[PDB]
């Protein structure tokens, strides 16, 4: 069944779901250097945006082939950010806490 | 502007090889800060480079 090839470092975006409960995986939990995966049953909803109304520009380089770069920002610039609901994150992190305590 | 009281992006201009090989032209664009690096062997801040 179709997997999602998304690139992402710390949080696995747009992923599938655990069917029953939060589960944890490691080659061996004794080795602290090993990655520890955590999988969630309840999806935490993350929304990100870059509200600077960036505009496209088309410089051209040598024969024919163009090169694109940012032109003037229309509007007043604002920070790029990501939003996560606090109660969802707190509850989910605490549940991951109990699942870690199942091994610790 | 105001020594970092802002969500800044830097503006920069540069010379490009236009459609004619030996009649280069000036151009302007803008880049986010992680993709610009200081160039000068001294403390000088006037001249910059792509991070590549």
């Amino acid at each position: 069944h179709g997997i999602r090839p998304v690139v992402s470092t710390q949080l696995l975006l747009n992923g599938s779901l655990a069917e029953k409960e939060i589960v944890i995986r490691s080659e061996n939990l004794t080795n602290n250097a090993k990655i520890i995966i955590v999988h969630l049953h309840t999806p935490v909803e993350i929304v990100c945006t870059r509200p600077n109304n960036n505009t496209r520009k088309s410089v051209r380089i040598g024969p024919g082939q163009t090169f694109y770069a940012t032109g003037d920002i229309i509007g007043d610039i604002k920070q790029a950010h990501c939003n996560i609901s606090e109660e969802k994150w707190n509850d989910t992190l605490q549940k991951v806490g109990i699942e870690l305590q199942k091994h610790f | 502007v105001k020594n970092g009281t802002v969500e800044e992006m830097k503006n920069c201009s540069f010379n490009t090889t236009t459609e004619i090989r030996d009649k280069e032209k000036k151009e302007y664009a803008l880049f986010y800060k992680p993709d610009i690096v200081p160039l000068s062997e001294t403390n000088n801040t006037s001249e910059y480079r792509l991070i590549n």
């Epitope: 509200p51 509007g75 007043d76 604002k78 920070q79 950010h81 | 502007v1 009281t5």
Partner: antibody, heavy 126, light 110 residues
Framework: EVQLVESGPELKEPGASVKVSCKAS????????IHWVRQAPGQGLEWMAW????????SFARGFQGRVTMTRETSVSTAYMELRRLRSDDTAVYYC????????????????????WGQGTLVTVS | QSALTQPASVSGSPGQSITISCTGT?????????VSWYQQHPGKAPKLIIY???QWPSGVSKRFSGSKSGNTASLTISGLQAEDEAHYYC??????????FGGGTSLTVL
Amino acid sequence: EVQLVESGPELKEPGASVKVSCKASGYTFTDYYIHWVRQAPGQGLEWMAWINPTTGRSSFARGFQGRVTMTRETSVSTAYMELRRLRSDDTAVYYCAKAGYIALYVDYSGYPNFNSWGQGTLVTVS
Amino acid sequence: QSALTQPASVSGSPGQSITISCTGTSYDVGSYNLVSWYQQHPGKAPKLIIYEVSQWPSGVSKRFSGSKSGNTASLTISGLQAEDEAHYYCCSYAGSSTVIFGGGTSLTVL
């Protein structure tokens, strides 16, 4: 509490620069866009420009693209604007007013609601 | 005047209900919902009404409810009292971070 104050009315020659001024009171001057608008005597309204009082960046009407100048005075709770290349047609009343809150994460520059006006000031062209 | 259009004058007797229209284009008002209206008696700065399409700024009562549809917007001057005789203006957010005003209007003297 809130009261916007402006300089007195002026008389000018064509092609001059009009230093219209706008001083604030009764609110944190750094937390709200100050927003400009024009009105010819006995006619409708015409938008002018934005200015972020904390950052100084601005954009303004295409109709005045020839030359317009802006300034923000954080320590004075006052902002300036300057119509330059003054025509006889540009004679009008000029206002400044308090527009939407400057969100740290949303481009509020654009929301046309402004709920506190200055008293108004005009320039005559002769 | 600019592209934002508004009727020149609308009239009516006391107790009537009137809609002052405001028209734009798909670019500006047909794509964004930031429409506001302003009231002005002559010789003074205008005063805001409807800070956002329908919401209410202050103790102005329900007599000026707004509405929008496509490139059109309306100001529902209702329960008319003749002392409200004044100029009324449309305005809305537009392209390129600009703001534009409607042509203005004149209310009843009847």
